[PDB]
Structure formats: structure tokens, C-alpha cells
């Protein structure tokens, strides 16, 4: 049971792991087939099915063994995880005329289990019908169902009837087998307590008392399997203590996997607010030896909205519900799960935790002190200026800057001003003085988990690095000795890694049961991987076959790193602009946690600088604007081992003592008097008195230097020290009153942050610099109007605006204009202001009557702990000073890009690139009117300054960020995407390996909008740049091309374009595309086809072959995309672009240029080839034709390549993209390509042209015959659950509607109709076969629609225009329907394939074809021939043609599609299409696919005698005696009921009848099914066809004159499986006919009543009373079946 539950959970995890979307569309098909052995006697059964709220109900049936074969559809749209938690409910009722319907049985199974089966469906299985209030009594019957789940792109499996599936429900064909137990499984989710729940109520209830930290009333709600259990509400407690078990329960086959714990703040007057949501995954805490789900006692961290309480609705409240990752810590909850395989009482759904468990849980919550450090290296790529930027580090609630704890946390950096990098971006100028953030937090020591997680992650990343080394080895075609050395290095590293012993879970308080189970599972997996590695090292030498096992090892290692008990909360770094939270980044705490067990047990970025991109608080990932690229060196660890921080510490940590001094101006002289309300000798505010003697060094610190003047030195920073080019910016300002007129502001010119600056006329270039532009100009490339102005508002007390918009409004009090142009190549220590405590600036003005100097003293660590003293600062400012700088030199080789978005109206863009690396940025050129630019540009950043040792740069390089932009001449430039990649760091000359261009993806939002071929290198610059390589050549001034060793090596290459034709050109502007032309551009070269004069008259290009010679790269990776444009030619010489496509996948185009028998009809063929009429039957004994049946489309058969192998189809696009998706499809270019390298020697002759033989490009008229066989499982379009389908075919301008020949009331219609049309290919190539619902009083609802490219049937290279049969036949029903004889088709494919034309022998027995001579005696060995066979030479030619891989005579199954459900099957349509071109003459006779009728039979029953009949149900006469008379009817024919004469006054149960019963019933021998058709009711508009198995009901009744007619027993005989009777009534007994429960009962002998004609014997009638079978009375019968002519030959009367 434990292993069964574990296998169930792992199966549902593996089956649900690919679905993550929040909405998804699904369809559930629930078919009920046959109920069997149902409880009760004389019952009247009906079935209701309830799926996901919707419900349906079968029509009413008869007897204890009903048959339905009725299908229901349930179309739902919800989360995939929600749908697997939903349930199917099959309920069986007994209807009544005057009462409500009573219940006997029920079955329930979730949608997840029927999704977990392969094919996403369980087919024709049996259910155990269980009474819900009487489940101890066992099964009260069985129910055969077949249920399907279809997702997007999924299809149902096909069906076969005689597939070991007819009957035999006993220990066979069950949905739930009897080997498993249907017991209850309970999970005891003990919920102990919670901590750090934020303020979620108003503070005005507390502050008028004159307890702000406890303003929440939390209770945890457990959502599991649709049920919700809420705990008690702890009023006014941010750290509640519930101590309550939640007893979740499931029936075993219907598991739910996702436990949802949601803490809610209870509100008396309003709705409950969401604190946070965490999930306990049952399959992640269980494994399949295996173990049941066990978890805890462990804290689960909650994440969601920021903790800062506002009375307003929270804009990030969706993060509290678990949607989105969460941006702030919302508390954590201590839970424990324990699985018991028992039925807990339902009254104990909520109960208190026992007191002994409360003492055990104390060892799982002991705290340990932790010290966290973060050295902020660089912050760059800032789009924002104004205010100031401060980074806050927090883990849990520790370090929360807005929290009202009294401790000064020092968890924030200082406020910094963004500085322009000269090109596009901004950066904080930290330089050699990095900010340092230190904080102290207390968490459980769970290092025994995170050490194993970190070591397994180190194993996984080493294995992934070696895997990528092997991939680059096999892709670069390296020598095999180096590949074997890399493989042996991989295997040796795996062997050395997986000998690692896991940390011992002994003697530690925080060890759980899940810790022991996970440790055992990890040790077993590591030992298995180690033994497989030792086996593989000596077993095999081929690295290609072994590589699939290495990926399995990496996937197994990825599964080992999962830790559900990671109670360490994430370190969240918040950028704060002004006082508002702006952007967040979440680093997992295990990624930076330090371990004393080694470097592998420590985190990947523990004590190492890492690049994190902060995100806006509801971004799935980075969008059009990144907030900041932040590089931070985070070291987390225990405070007891904080002395180990010195090895990870780079630079010297320095703290400062800070002090201010103030003076005022009296009588024209400065003096300390006049300070009204402020001290002489004080802080920055002036309200707190300090001294230089007050500040003293703490424990572990000493003074360095002396108390000195520090007037904020280096504030006039040199932002352009290492720059060869720069762009200066001065922001003109202008102010007005609201509603007034504009005038220049008092700060008429500022910098980007708002601090005042010089006028454009005042400033000059510095020495060593000169202007590139002669005058300033405003920037239109912003959020500004036509004159370069953005507009803002001022609210007091803020002097200047903080937000700006692009348009002028009357409430705007300010406006700002950015002026840019480019460039090439006091000492006393006091600051002055007009007011006391004001903003003191550099020099004294006329009104500055106050002054103030800033003052500092340096302080350095003293004791042996060194850099660990920053954790002992228990707040002054902590910084990290680097004593030296390392100069580097970065070169980015931006070669080209492909498949970019179209962001202009002319379906192209003008892409350029902003290449950014740390505090440096440069711009590539703009390539106009392309989506596949080739910049061919080397971007050189000379003399970039990176601090820290070069080894830390080599291990973790800063990222190079590639922001692509569509340039627009007006307005702001639009965003194309962002590519982040690392450069190749070179610290010396001996590792000078040439960098390799790679196709990094261009990330626009969550989808990949193209790729860019780009690489970078970062060379440690030596003395005077001597070790730097040579500068690249220049094709323009300051424009380097990508150098020869890094550029793809080009060779002369031919591109052949089969410009066949254009299809479905939608209208451009006000007119249709009448005069198009094709332009094919690749590699900078372009070719143009001839102009089609009229596309309507000629949809194909006259010159269908184009040729071009482009220098293309030898490497298949570096192949540029194939650009196609279509140019319409119009009046006034206008040539617009009316469509374009990009084909980046070109290796498909690579090629080597030098390389009882009178019933026989078509339905006999169909039933012999697709069904189970007769296994090895009479038809295949004659050896006639067999059809092929495809379960999918003919274009989805992989043998024929989708019928595009003549010419493929590429969709054209136009206009701007549809929110980063594809643009509007304005047509389809049809053609193919052949790319092959040309010889570089002109004396060598050219390779032959690959498009050798082409068909006629003029339009051809074709006779198209669409034979539609039948529909299967159509979506219902009526209120009764059925449909009235017909066929509507649209072919160009001709529409055939078969509405007058619809089929009434079926979901499996048998159409059997051929529709012959004429059309002109390829103008009318789009054949559209649609199914519509006949409706008398309403409009017709469309079932589905499928599209056939008839040009892909005609011009296909595999002969799909007519499927060739296996038999050349000239007469009868299998007559050759193709136009061409098999000799003509054989010589056609011979002229095709480069083969010689085949020669005919004189006697027709030999055909020589392609170097092989074929004989008719080869194929006709032991083959039966008949009179309808044709010529022997055509027979042999047809036998040869089937070995050529052509399309056989087939019935494809086309999926019906609809906009109601865009990728879900609305039904299936078995059919096929023959296309016959009229240039090849008339075709043969069409196949008569008209559906056969049901042959009428009469079932003849003789009622000889009866024996042992139960006594009569009493009446007024009241005597103890028996009444025997026999009723008889066939189900479906209850209007033809007949009865015998009543044998009254029986004394021993015997009655002599000699009666007869003649029941007319229709029959299909092929389907083995009876046919009955009737109207259901009075308002039934048309007749419904019902297909049921033929069966006979024979009942014993007991008539009374003085009372109602009464019933005794029933007997049922299947006409296909008639049970062989006993020859004597003594041998006839109860239960010789099968009883179906268990324990292998007697299988009765069966014989067919259709095959064996007549037999005589005895059969028992029986009933079920009180759950047990009762012998109701035997009856002697003779059963035989007559047909019509046998009935006229010998009538019975
Ligand atoms: C005098 C106070 C009466 C308060 C009467 C009262 O019931 O107020 C309820 C509302 C909302 O309070 P919640 O705790 O639901 O907010 C939950 C929150 N949106 C969240 O999601 O975090 O309070 C206000 O609007 C603030 C009024 C301030 C009035 C000064
Ligand atoms: C109450 C009077 C207006 C009723 C307007 C209206 O919507 O009628 C729809 C119904 C059902 O329409 P269908 O049978 O095509 O089922 C379609 C299926 N449910 C589906 O869509 O899948 O029509 C009638 O009952 C027939 C008489 C109509 C007389 C107007
Ligand atoms: Ca509240
Ligand atoms: Ca509350
Ligand atoms: Ca509320
Ligand atoms: Ca644009
Ligand atoms: Ca543009
Ligand atoms: Ca309808
Ligand atoms: Ca209808
Ligand atoms: Ca309708
Ligand atoms: Ca009776
Ligand atoms: Ca009677």
C-alpha cells in the first residue's frame, strides 16, 4: 500500500509536470457502454454522469444488463492543476413513473488518473459500482466506461472491439484492479505556529488608547482535494500558536497532490485579507525502498506583497495568493505532515495537537545566530534620474528598513546619485569605495540539508560543464583522442564526485523523518550513479551512445538537489528610490550560505560577486526596461564561524566616525552664535548634540589618522576619465502657474538629477576634449512632444517634479527639455546656505547667511578577527576600500541578428544595439528596413575599471547586455529585446584562444523574439596596452569590422530558389496585389524574379527558377537567415512591400548536388481492413483488396513528408507585430530551396541545377472527387446531446451544401457519399470540408472544419492524387479508378527519379526497372487469382509501384477543428480525396461507397416446457400454488412484446406451453450489431438510429385476475455468445450461467447463434433477491435464427 501510494504520486508527478499555464482549454469525453450484473430484480436502469459541474443523463433502458453506447462531452477551461483535482461522478439510478429515482451504485475517480494513462485516456474498462451508504456490502454491479481527456494538440487513441475486451470483467479489463485496496489514506497536517506575520489591520484601533506589531488576526486555511479546513482564529497576534491537526482524507485512487496552506487575516466587518500562500507538494516529499509523504516539523516561508500596511487596496495583492513568485517575506508557518493508511473518524477533521508532540517540536525551532554581509560592487543600467538610490538587504523580517523595531539595522547602503555613462545609461559611482551592508538574523541551523544541496549542485554544475564540453567537442568535429580525453575526464569527475558521503543526520536536533528518507534516497541514487560510472568506464568506448546516460545522470542529480524543507528564507535586495520601494531581487539563502564542511558544501556565490538583475514587483521577467544590473558580493554564514569571512573578504573594510559643525553670519563675520534651535557642535540635523570625544572605537576597532575636515570630497567626479567619446546633457527647465503662461525657471539649466548646472553657452570642453556637434539640440528620442518637452507637476513640500509625461496639460506647473551634443577625444571646507539647516552648497551667495562643514575621522579594524569586525558594530557607515584598480579592455563582436520583431508599418524595423558592460555603454549603427541586420561591428570599450582580484573577474565575469531597439525617426525608439551573455576573460597572453560567436537569444518579455550572433572578450590590460591584440580594420571612421579569426569563414555558395507561386495574397491598402514579384535576399546579395502581370490569371511565376551566388559561412551554425519579400508594382512607379518572411532553418534545404459472397462492395474492403468482422475472414481467403487506414491526416503521415516535398509553404507577414507575436498573415509564398557550395575554381564546371524536372506552371483544371466515409465522435450541437450532421464543402467559388441529405441524431454518422467537383488549381487549392448541424428552427452550428491543400495532392512527389490499390482490377466493384495505367505511372516515376524508362517484355512477365528485373512470379507465389484481374503487365507494374513508397489506396482520418476550441478535436472525419487533372484524360468509375442496409432477420424461439417455478405472488384467492407464463422480447423492440397462455394451478412448478416467438430485428453481420430505429417521443422531429448487441429477454411471470401482474425471474441470452444448454432439466442448475464477482468463477461455454443454427436444451431463469441469486425456474427452449428467404421457405406462423 505504501509502495502503491508512492508509485501513484510519482506517476501523477511525471504526468503533470509539463503543464504550468494559468488558463488552459480541455475536453472530456465520457462514454458509457454497458451495465452488467446490476443489483435488484425487474429494475429499470439509467445513468447520470457529472463532470466538473456539468451533467448529462442516458435514455431509459431495460433489464439488469443495460446497453447504452452513449457519449457525453464536457468542455471546460481552467488551470491544468485544477482539472486533475476535479472528479468524475458516475451514478446509476432506477427511475420510477410516480417517484424520484432511487440509487444502487456509484463510482468516483479524478480526472488526474484518467489523464495519467498513456494516450491520456483509459479505454473500455470496468467500474465497481458501490453503494455509498452501504460500501461494506461490496460491489452491487459493474459499469463499462471509456473516458478520454484531450489537451491542446492531443488526440484520442483508436478503438478495436475484438481486442480481448468483449465481456470478461472478472479480474480482467478493470479500471481499478482487485489487487489494490480501495482504502482511505489520511494525512495529519499538524499546524503548530506562525511567526513574523505583517500588519494587516488598521492601526487606529490601537493608537487612540495611547501594540502596533500585533495588528493581525490570523488563521490558516488548508485547501486539499476541493475541501477547505480552517483553523481557529488567534485574535491580535503576529506570532500565533494554533497547535491543531488537520485531518485531510482521500479515497486511494483519487489522490490530490497540492496542499495549499493560506494564512488569512480575519476581519470582522470586511473580507478576509490574504497574508500569504505556500504549497506542500506530496510527490516532492515522497518517493518510490520508498516512503510515504512525510514532512516537517519545518518552517515554510510565505512570499507576496510588501509588508508596509496601507488602508488602500494593495496593488500587489495577487502575489499573496501564490500567483507570481512574491517580492517580500510574509512570515513563515511551522507544519508537519504524517501519512497514515487508515480511516480516521470524520468527526476528527480538526483536533488539538497532543501535549507530547509539543515537547518534540521544541528541538526543531532552536535558533542560531547568523551574520550576513553584502559588498555592493556596481549598480548600472539605470534608466532613472532624480531622487537617490539606496539598496536594502533583508532576510526574513530582519533588515526591514520600514519596520518599526527600535534597533538601527544598518541594512542599507547610502543614497547615491546616478551618473551618466556618456552614451545611454546611468550608474552609481561607487568606484574604489563599495558600500557594505551588514545585518544579523536568527534561523534554525538546517546546514545538514543545505550542505548536501550545495554539494549536489556543485556535482550537477561540474557535470553540466563537462557535458557542454562534450557537446562542443562533437559539434566542432575535434579529433577523437581529445573527445575520448574529455569523456574520460567527465567519467573520472563523476566517479570522484559521487563517492561523497552525505552529512550524518545523527546527533542533530533539526533532523526530521523526511531528512532520513531523503538522505537514504540520495545515498542510493549516488551509489547507483557511481556504480554505473565504474561500469561505463570499463564497458564502452563510444561517447555517442554513452552520452544519453550522462543526461540521465544530470537529470537524476537535478532531482536530488530539491529540498522541500529549506526553511532558510531568501535574501531580498530592494532598490529604493526616494523613500519608495522600486525593484527587488531574490537570492536563495543556500546559494550564499557558508559551510565548514568545505567549498562544495558552501554556496555557489558564497563570498563571490554575482550578477543579479532586479525586477519590478509584478514582472514575470525583465521587460522593456531593466531597473538595475547589480553586482553584489554576498556572504551568509553562522556568527560562530564569522572569523572565516576573512578568506572571502577582498579589500579593507573601513568604518567612519561622522560629525558636523555649524556657524552663522553676524555683523559680517562668521561665528558659532546665531544658531537658533541648533547646537554649535552637532549632527546633520542640528538637533542632536554630539562631540568628537563621544565617538569611540568599539570592540575590535582602532582609530586611523586624526579628526579632519571632510567637505564631501570627490563630489565633482570625473565621469569621463577612460572615455574616447562622450555625450553631455543639460536639462533646460521652465515653470508656470497652473493655467498661466510659461517663463524660464529659477533653475533654468540643471543636470539629470535636478541639481543646478551651467547654461549651454557657459560650459566648454575640458582640455583633451573637443566638440563633435557645433551646437546643442533637443532630444526627440524620449517621452516628449514635438518640441522636446516633457511635463510635470509640483506638490508641496516637494520643490521639483518627480514624474513627467509626454503631453502638455493645464495642471502642469513645470516642463523639462533634454539638450545633448557629443564630443570626441571652498578649500576652507565649508558649505553655505541661506537658511539654517538648509541645503548647503559649494560657495557663498549674496543671501547665504549660514555655513556648515562636514567632518570625519577614519577607523580601521584592530584585532586578529580582521574583516570579521564589521559584524561587531553593535550605526556608522561601513565601506570597502580597494587599494588598487585593474584595467581591462572589452571587445564585443556584434556580427548579425535574425528573426527580430517588426515594429514599423512597412513590416520591417531599423534595428540598432546598445552594448553595455558595467559603467560603460556604446551604440552600434542603424541598419534600415530589415528584420535580419548585419551590423558587422566591433564595439570596443578601452580602459574599463573593474575592482577586485582578476581571478574573481575570471570566475564571475560581469555580463554584457545587448538591448536591441527599432529606430524611429519620430517618437521614442521601440524595444526589440535583450540578450545577456558573458565575455571570455583573458588574464594573460598564454590562454589567447580565439572567441567563438554564439546565437544568444533575444529576450523580449517571456518569449524569444529572435537571436543575435555575438561574442565578447575581456582582456586584462597590461602596461600601455601592449598585450592587447591588433585593432580591427575600419570600413568607416570609428567603425571596426569583426576581425578575420572571429568572423564566419565564407565560401562561394549557390542558392536555388524555386519561385513557384504565391497563394492567398490578402489586399494591401485599397487594392488587391495584382502585379507581384519575388525578392530573395541572403548574405547581402539579392535576386529578383520576373513580375507576374496578373496574379488572378496566372498565380505562378513564369521563370520558376532563380539563381544567386552568395558568400555563405562554411559552418552550418553561422548560416544567415533567408529573407523573402514580395513587391507589388502599382501606378506612379510605386513598389511597396506587401509581405515578408524569414527562414532561419536552412539545413533542410542543404543537398549534395552530385548525389454469401454477393454482398461484396467497398464496405467489404473497409470492414475487412479496419474492423473485426471476421479474423482471417472469408474476404481475405479470396484475396481481394485491403485499404490502408491512417489514424491521422495524410499530411501527418511521416512516410510522405507532409506532401510539401515538391515545394514547401512559408507564411508571409505584414505590419507591426501583434504584441511581440507574429504579425498579420497576408499570404503564403510557395516554393523550396537548394543550398549547395559552389566550386571556387572557375575552370571546374558548375554543379547541375537541382530543380531538374518541373511540372507545367500554368493553371490546370482538375476533377476532384471527395469520398467521405463516416464521422467519428463528433462534438454535439443539440440540446439532446446528439447532432444532425451533414457535409458542406467550399472549394474556391463553388459551394456544395448537403443539408437536404443530413443524417439525423448521431455522433457517429455513416455518410458514404461522394461529391464530385471541378476547380482550377492552384487558384482554388484550398479545399474546405466542414460538418454542420441541421436545425429546423435555429441557425446551423458548425461542428468542425479541415483544410486540404489540393495542390499538395496534385503536385506532390509521392502520387497522393490517387491512392494505388494492391490489385489491378478492371471489372466489378474494385475497378481501377485512376486515369493512368500502372505502366504509365511506373514510367512517370522512372522519368522522375533519374531512372531509365522501363522496358516491357513481349509476354509481359518481366519489367526491368532501375537496374533490377522484377517478375510477376515473385509476387504471385501462393496467391489466389480471380476473374476480375486485369492485364498481367499492369499487375506487375502496380506491384512494383507499391515498393516505391507511393501513397496507397487509403482512408485518412482528418481532425475537425473549430474556433470554439482552437487546438482540440471537435470530431474526426474518415474520408479521402482523389484529384484528377483533365490533361490526363477522364478517370475511371467512382467507388460506390454507399452504406449497406441492415439485413432483416427473424429470431425464432420455441417455449417447450418449464420446471421448478417459484410460487405465485398472492391475491384474493390466497392459496399456495404457482402460475407460469412466459414473456419474451428483444431490447429495443419492447413494442413487439408477446406472451404465452397462462398455465394456472401448477402444483410442482411445471408448465407445458409448446409456444412460439418470432421477433423481427435488423442486423449488420459486419458490425455484429442489431439495428433499431424509432422516434423517442411525440415532439421528436426525426428518427434516431440505435446500435445494440442482439440479445433475447425471456421472463417468467405470474398472472392474477384479482390483482396486478407480478414478476418472478428473468433470463438473458447474447445472440453472439449463446451459452450452451444442458440436455436435461436435472443437469440444468443455478449458476451454470456465469456469476461475476471474484475468485475465478466458472466460464460457461459459448457458441454463436448466427454460426451454429439450432440446438435444444434447458436454460435457467433467475432473479437477485437480498443480494443473492435465486433459482426462479428452468425453461426448455430451442433457439435458431432465420433470414428472410428462410422465413418465406418455411414459415412458422
Ligand atoms: C477609524 C478606523 C476605522 C476602520 C473601519 C474599518 O473597518 O476599516 C476597514 C478598512 C480596510 O481595513 P482592512 O484591515 O480590511 O485593510 C486591509 C488592507 N487593505 C490590506 O490588504 O492590507 O480600513 C480603511 O479603509 C482604513 C480607514 C482609516 C481611517 C483613519
Ligand atoms: C425561447 C424561444 C427562443 C429560443 C432561442 C434559442 O436559442 O433556441 C435554441 C433552441 C435549441 O437550439 P438547437 O436545437 O439548435 O440546439 C443548439 C445547442 N444547444 C447548441 O448550441 O449546442 O432551439 C429550440 O429549442 C428550437 C425552437 C426555437 C424557436 C425560436
Ligand atoms: Ca484586515
Ligand atoms: Ca483583522
Ligand atoms: Ca479586509
Ligand atoms: Ca517603429
Ligand atoms: Ca523604425
Ligand atoms: Ca443545433
Ligand atoms: Ca440539430
Ligand atoms: Ca441551431
Ligand atoms: Ca402474483
Ligand atoms: Ca397469480
Residue numbers in the entry: 174 to 383, 390 to 467, 493 to 1029, 1047 to 1095, 1126 to 1406, 1447 to 1984
Lines quoted from the article behind this entry:
In our efforts to identify an optimal membrane system, we observed that the cytosolic region of myoferlin (residues 1–1997) formed stable complexes with large MSP2N2 (membrane scaffold protein 2 N2)-based lipid nanodiscs, comprising anionic phospholipids and chosen to accommodate all interacting domains. We further stabilized the myoferlin-nanodisc complexes through glutaraldehyde cross-linking and imaged four different protein-lipid samples, which were assembled on membranes containing PS (Phosphatidylserine) alone or combined PS and PI(4,5)P2 (Phosphatidylinositol-4,5-bisphosphate). As observed in 2D class averages, the individual structural motifs of myoferlin are distributed in an almost coplanar manner around a ~30 Å central cavity, describing an elliptic ring that spans ~150 Å and ~90 Å along its long and short axes, respectively. In the nanodisc-bound structure, the cytosolic region of myoferlin engages the lipid surface primarily through the C2B-C2G, C2C, the inner DysF, and C2F-C2G domains, establishing a total of four membrane anchoring points. The local resolution of the myoferlin map enabled accurate modelling of three bound Ca2+ ions and a recruited PS molecule, revealing an intricate membrane recognition mechanism. Intriguingly, the modelled PS headgroup (C and EV1B), originating from the lipid nanodisc, binds at the interface between the L3 and the L4 loops of C2C in all membrane-bound myoferlin structures. In this configuration, the tip of the L3 loop inserts into the lipid bilayer (residues F1628, T1629, and R1630), contributing, along with the L1 loop, to the coordination of three Ca2+ ions. Besides establishing new interdomains contacts, the rearranged C2G simultaneously engages the lipid membrane with its Ca2+-binding loops and β-hairpin subdomain, inserting into the bilayer in the vicinity of C2B and C2F, respectively. Interestingly, our structures show that C2G binds more tightly phosphoinositide-containing bilayers, possibly because of additional interactions between its polybasic patch and exposed PI(4,5)P2 headgroups, as previously suggested and/or observed in other C2 domain structures.
Ferlins are ancient membrane proteins with a unique architecture, and play central roles in crucial processes that involve Ca2+-dependent vesicle fusion. Ferlins, such as dysferlin (FER1L1), myoferlin (FER1L3), and otoferlin (FER1L2), form an ancient group of C2 domain Ca2+-sensing proteins present in almost all eukaryotic lineages. The top arch of the ferlin ring, composed of the C2C-C2D region, is rigid and exhibits only little variability across the observed functional states. In contrast, the N-terminal C2B and the C-terminal C2F-C2G domains cycle between alternative conformations and, in response to Ca2+, close the ferlin ring, promoting tight interaction with the target membrane.
